[PDB]
Structure 1
Amino acid sequence: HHHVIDELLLFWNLAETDRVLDELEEALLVSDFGPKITVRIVERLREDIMSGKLKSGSEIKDALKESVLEMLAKKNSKTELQLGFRKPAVIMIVGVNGGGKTTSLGKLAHRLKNEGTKVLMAAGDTFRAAASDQLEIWAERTGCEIVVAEGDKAKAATVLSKAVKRGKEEGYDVVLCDTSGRLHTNYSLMEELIACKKAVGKIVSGAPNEILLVLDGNTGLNMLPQAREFNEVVGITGLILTKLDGSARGGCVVSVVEELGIPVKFIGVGEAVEDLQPFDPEAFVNAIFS
């Protein structure tokens, strides 16, 4: 329980500015901001210290918080889930292997069900061992119905198609679509993602209303090529930043939003059904800096 940034800024006076900002720079790198963002943040703080605008350790920390909040707000759309006006709305969850797609979908279904929303799940991961069984356990936990492929040769796009069709015929509010993990460097799996988006759109105009990219909070600067390629290929409407209850800080998410304008919409903070929180930028920046 040491607050790194609180403690280095306690040393600040005007004459210690360089020694303190050197320490602040190491603290941001260690939080996975990367050298490019860190240099920008630190250089803007050094100018505002030297012009006498920032006059204490806490003004510096407030200006540090302010500059990251500004980068997180460099988006074009809202952080709320944007479901459509058509029934059902369709949400796809995508991202690299291991990041937390299936768990986050279950936790999101739990939130929608608490709100009275009628949710249908689609087991679009037809590749990995026991992917359906795993999503089925989440369905039973959250009280959702689920569409599971009958055969082993089933295609992700066909499963999501049948599910979105079933959601329309039976008056579901939301159809939540799982998908198998894929590396943004795998051309044929990124193509398969384009086929799902096209297939779902043929049943409800405007579907999918949300395509949420899952980003593992343990990942360093590779978060940015991930978000770039996925967004280029299908169009990402929001981020899910998972595993922030660990010791990783997820600082690289700041440059993702800053470069791409994709709002962070949820954070994962554990493995239980309740451990999905809607993104609150003030809470996030306060947490990352102490």
Structure 2
Amino acid sequence: SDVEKVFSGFSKTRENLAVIDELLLFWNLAETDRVLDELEEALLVSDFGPKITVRIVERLREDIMSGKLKSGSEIKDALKESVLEMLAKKTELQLGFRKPAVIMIVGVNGGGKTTSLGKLAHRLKNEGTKVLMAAGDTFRAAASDQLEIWAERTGCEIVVAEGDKAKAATVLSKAVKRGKEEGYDVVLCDTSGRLHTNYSLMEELIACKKAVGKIVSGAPNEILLVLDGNTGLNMLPQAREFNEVVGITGLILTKLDGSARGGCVVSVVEELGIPVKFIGVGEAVEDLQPFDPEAFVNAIFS
């Protein structure tokens, strides 16, 4: 079920990568170079970036020439293993034991940042976690309102901004101070949503993590970057930017339901070394799924 969510999320990627099975029917030692040329094309087509594609393909070539892989089916399994190792190389939320844990959620418009926060709150509440929401998306009035609805839905308290021109850092500080005083397990912090990254946005995010750190030592525990999965490889420059400016601990890739760009998941993880912790594969609250690298590899290749 949970597992079969992901099978649908990447159904189109799986259909497209299936051409690899057909190609491998015609593999033999002599045909290795031509077969690998075609495998390379298929990976690129599904948004495996140039860097990982060459890495995967050349490792297969080596292992074929060395005699480690002696059949099409062995080659296909080595392909799956090579991808799994690029992925899994922790995807769970690392909240520790000190209370409160602090989670910031960041990302640009269209990525489902505020919505994912709501769905995460719903998930945490399910496991019996005491959650305070903090509406630090001060740029988007509609986000703050949406979050209040989410707070009502999930049964969380929410700290909201006073006014249309509140400082996010101020709202977050107030939230974490309160979470600490009132014995909350987790403070879930939203942050400002913009059309695209810019100097103001990053300055703002830096100010935010600095303020929460002032109140609780080590905060935030997690800074999760939410990305529209449909942007494929075009997400990498942006994730790279968030990471070197702010310091991201986990990715959430959304809107993935039905995608043909499954390769980008592997590409973004291996390039930046940040784990994908959740994937959004639907509009339902329970369509925010923790990421399972093995099931993903099976979903796109099998």
Q: TM-score, normalised by structure 2?
A: 0.88
1:120–1:239 CA distance, 2 compared to 1 (3 A): same
Q: Is the 8 A contact 2:279 2:288 kept in 1?
A: yes
- Structure 2, unaligned stretches of length 5 or more? 1-18
Q: What's the counterpart of residue 175 of structure 2?
A: 163
1:200–1:11 CA distance, 2 compared to 1 (3 A): same
Q: Which moved more, 1:243-252 or 1:270-279?
A: 243-252
The residue matched to 1:90 in structure 2 has which SS?
Answer: strand
| Structure 1: distance between partners of 2:297 and 2:175 | 38
Match of 1:37 among 42, 52, 55: 52
Residues 73-132 of structure 1: CA deviation (Å, up to 9, x unaligned) = 338xxx221113222110001122211211211111111111110111111111124111
Q: Is the 8 A contact 1:184 1:230 kept in 2?
A: no
1:17–1:220 CA distance, 2 compared to 1 (3 A): same
More helix by share: 2
- Deviation of the 1:16 alpha carbon: 3.3
CA RMSD of aligned residues (A): 1.8
Residues 206-263 of structure 1: CA deviation (Å, up to 9, x unaligned) = 1111101112211132322222211111211111122222223342232333233222
| Structure 1: distance between partners of 2:193 and 2:111 | 8
- Deviation of the 1:5 alpha carbon: 2.9
Q: Is the 8 A contact 2:229 2:256 kept in 1?
A: yes
- Deviation of the 1:279 alpha carbon: 1.6
The reply to whether residue 262 of structure 1 matches residue 274 of structure 2 is yes
Q: What's the counterpart of residue 27 of structure 2?
A: 12
1:211–1:30 CA distance, 2 compared to 1 (3 A): same
Question: How many residues are paired up?
Answer: 284
- Deviation of the 1:17 alpha carbon: 2.6
- Deviation of the 1:175 alpha carbon: 0.7
- Structure 1, unaligned stretches of length 5 or more? none
Q: Is the 8 A contact 1:139 1:145 kept in 2?
A: yes
- Deviation of the 1:192 alpha carbon: 0.2
Higher relative contact order (CA 8 A, sep 6+): 2
Match of 1:108 among 110, 120, 143: 120
Q: Which moved more, 1:161-170 or 1:45-54?
A: 45-54
Identical pairs, percent:
100
